[model samples]
Target: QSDTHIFIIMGASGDLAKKKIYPTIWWLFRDGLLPENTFIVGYARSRLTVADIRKQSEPFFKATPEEKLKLEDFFARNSYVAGQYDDAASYQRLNSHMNALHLGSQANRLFYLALPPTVYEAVTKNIHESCMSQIGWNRIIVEKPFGRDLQSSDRLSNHISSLFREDQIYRIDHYLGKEMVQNLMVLRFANRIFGPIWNRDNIACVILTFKEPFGTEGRGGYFDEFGIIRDVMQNHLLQMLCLVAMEKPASTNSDDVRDEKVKVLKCISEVQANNVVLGQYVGNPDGEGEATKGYLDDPTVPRGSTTATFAAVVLYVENERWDGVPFILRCGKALNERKAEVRLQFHDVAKRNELVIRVQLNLPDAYERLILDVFCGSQMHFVRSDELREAWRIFTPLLHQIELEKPKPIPYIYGSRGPTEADELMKRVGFQ
Candidate 1:
């Protein structure tokens, strides 16, 4: 039998909790991934009860009568505590609630911070002061878009490193939890044919894509702060590149895998202005005759916003395995469809032998997979501190260049493949 533990979700009343967090936990509980003695505590300042959280999460959990009964029982083990995230007294009260469970030395704690980044410092301070477990393990899971650029990211890293040891913190990016993304390892190392030809000599180019058919719809306030590169390219797309380009790890150990991934990142040359394309979608009627708005058309978007909703950049690995091969990362909103995939195109006579990993279509929710990893104490799919720094090193210069240039983005229709430059760029890079 495992030790009893408490799972505390801070910002429990927020959209993320209702839409993903609670629902995923229910699935885990249903699947028996959580330990039998685990207790769930929801914390927020909105004065919600356990029932209120259940109601918000129910629509996403959909269950049969038998499972519904089980769900009810699960919530019976669940409870809520309303309090401020930054207040020490509030955390003290939360500590009291956990202590009341009386699990003694078995009371391990897992804190999931689902709030905005602005509150991270305050919440973390309060947690360090009041909620850290005295006798058992204490772990914290943080969300991404960690910082806007290298300097701020370094600062955030220093702040977090001061509060928790590296192993105690889990910095999560849900993209890593995607089934196809995880399968990349098996797809490469597990297959003999792929292992031989997965290099610049045989592969022409590697392309990673993320597309969303819908625009912000007046809800792009957050997207404006970090453009498509920071919002998608830097984290999600870059992670994919590492998977495709990394050497075989020594073993399946998390650090071993991450070390290879970091090596691949370190080999990547910083992106340059010529090897990039930026676009902003314009209002145009879809096939359904409904008009889709541009990034600038959103009332919530700042006037004259240079923020790009579409970005494509090319990166090269200086290592022998991928010296001349182009790794193209692309992402955009208000495109033709919703899809995420990696395509590896081969050269000349091998052109027809392209390999693609299509992700995000009818797949299990990414949050479910990531949350399960947290419960299992698996760090294989999460980003590490040095990995974060290397990623910033690879992209920070390009981000600054874009800012200084403030170049006008090429305009495209609200629902198209992207600017013609994207197609030309791919062709120039030998991606047929």
Candidate 2:
């Protein structure tokens, strides 16, 4: 009689945990979607109580009066523990904590990390040494910045691979869980209309956009370090592009779907410097009432910061299926409106035919579907090691040069629709 399932959140006090993971678990449980008798345990270096955790997580799940009774019951089944990472004794402490939840039955253990990337090796290794679930199963969920570049990403992947089987580890990329993103294959394959016209001949161009209406108000310090490329283009925008460009997989299996994704990433043409337009926001001096502060104006950001808040890049998929067709991928802050979308363009002006797909949509958002997938042991909506490596390989050279050279980014006004040169670059690349 299986009775328990233990879920341990490693960075229990971290912002992402308080903001996303904790609330997500509550929503999942409220819907009766969580496994039976699941016990939630919060783990972190800080000696914090569940009361403190509840305080920060309160604003997220504002339950009604009827739901307040249910909320009290939710926390009754939850707890917290403080532990050190490298020490086996710390893991042993965690092991004993999880052991109490078993009830002499087969109880699965789920470890979720929202910790810094450098800490993964120590924590996961220690998890393998002392906290592994012997009676049921073990699972570890990790989010990204997997590594800054290809070499380090490979190193990190190799270390984790040695400790756990690939199937036991789930790597999350939230974009893959978006409603339309998850609907992509069904739109292309299940529906008979798209297959014939979904190729290079019929589709002259593919455009992907990730736009933000405001800059990093006071958060430019962290934003300046990674810039727009690492922040959005490298992961989210690229993930969407692959889904739009990938060929039909042989079957609906996870591996088959991911195999095609890897193929698309592998075949993507190198991003030339000429194809990239980078810009940073500047204050709009013309405003009389209250002026908009620029990226450098943020007290946290250095005066000479050259980090790009906007970028429009042209990418090409060189394989026969998508030969010569341009994929314009762009992201920016302090732009016109908050929107993200995909647009497909055809060659004929007389035909004037086009298809538009919006990336951001109204729903429970990308988290619910992804969390459910991780619990069910389906990596379909997750990023693979090979795919990560290939993606980094494509962008590393350009990223390194950008840092080494420290080129001055073009200046753009706060409320404008990014730099005009970006639109000019698209026209030069044969955007009709």
Candidate 3:
């Protein structure tokens, strides 16, 4: 299976596959990560000619900022296949097409299902019936709303589990895939000191937020059903919390880290009463109209849905590492600008000191800072920790000013680089 590489993009013509996936492949090819032997088989019910596929994918590479410079010979490998995808025969055809791409050799397959939830069953059933080959490795990657609630999610997991092993089924909480989240292990374990103070003893709270730029539009119908809780919270927010509250692992192996994470997930305390807050965005001048009402008035939503556009909750863990530290999670849509982040709050220093760690997407220059008594801690060393010292430059006054003012936050929004207001709130309540 490892001999050949094949990516079967299910919703090949969809905006996501065209704009993101193809460009990603181009960049991978341009960077020499993707071998010329690799194959891309785009599958969709729509009758898109190979020329159409190339045309649509070309713009994303030429125009997309991070992708523009990555024009590669990979474009020659593009091919499209028409398949209704609802029938077993079509899946068999897809299988045959993949096999042909390898010219009878063994191949590793990456199946990308980029369609709506409604068709997932039909699509998955077809894959089970005929898509996979006996000697090949097959992996499926899909987008979110994996399910509406816990039960549904479990059902979906069980359904997919029947076909693909959990390891083969890659669920991309893309946030988790970001460079910042990838740094969690090093930031947590590489340093000898952060590990000691990581638990509830030294830390006060942890917060992860996922805020959106715009409302669901009139499409709040689907969104209202899940609201903030089931939508972003069930996945990203809690996942981030897992990374924060998880204990130091025995090693950096994936299994070991996952094991520690499972332990932390098991320790999650139930949401305390009154610790949860629900909010809906108010009608604003920026929206369609002042009388546009709030979430209640969205044309596609039920009245008084209470399906909050925003929600926050304080969570705890019973384990020693984070037994009492409050893990505050806040997420919302519409009301504010788009923002997503994780912040770890430490107990106040004996002297005027506080350390902040901010990691986000788009928001570059976001960094980690420590506070301590100038005399007690080494102040002369502009870079205190080993990893930070290596990864971060000791910014001179002028350079610091320039870096902060311009486009800094890499994964974060354009302007937000420093510690945020919510961190300040945690600092006030004895979060020294």
- Order the numbered candidates by lDDT, best leading: 2, 1, 3
lDDT of candidate 2 over 1-432, digit per residue (tens): 155788889989998899888998998888788886888999988999999999889789866777887688788888998988787787888888888775513588889988988899999899899888888688899878778877888899889888998778788766323463444434344323465677888888888888877778788987777889888888778877887788877887888888988998999856868999999988878853223688888999988998899999998988888888999998898887777878899878464577887644444555787777767777876778788788888888888889899889999998788899999998898776
How high is the CA lDDT of each candidate model? 0.81, 0.81, 0.57
Worst 10 residues of 2 by lDDT: 183-192
Overall local distance difference test of candidate 2: 0.81
Higher-TM-score candidate among 1 and 3? 1
Instruction: Give the per-residue lDDT of model 1 (tens digit) for 266-293.
Output: 8987888799999988888554433456
Measured against the true structure, the TM-scores of the candidates, in listed sequence, are 0.90, 0.92, 0.72
- How close to the true structure is residue 145 of candidate 3, measured as C-alpha lDDT? 56
Candidates ranked, most accurate by TM-score first: 2, 1, 3
Which stretches of model 3 miss by more than 4 angstroms? Answer: 1-3, 63-73, 175-193, 210-222, 283-305, 334-341, 347-353, 360-432
Candidate 2 or 1, higher TM-score: 2
- Give the best candidate by TM-score: 2
Tens-digit lDDT string for candidate 3 (1-432)? 344667778899898787777766665666565544678889999989778877877776655555444443365576788889687777777788777774524766667787776687778778877777667666676556565544455566667777766555555434223353434433444333466667676667677667665667678897766556656665556656666666777875555566655666667644532455555665554445422455555788876455555656666778766676777777766544455666676666664343545544441111111011111122221211121111112112222332244322111121122124334444543344
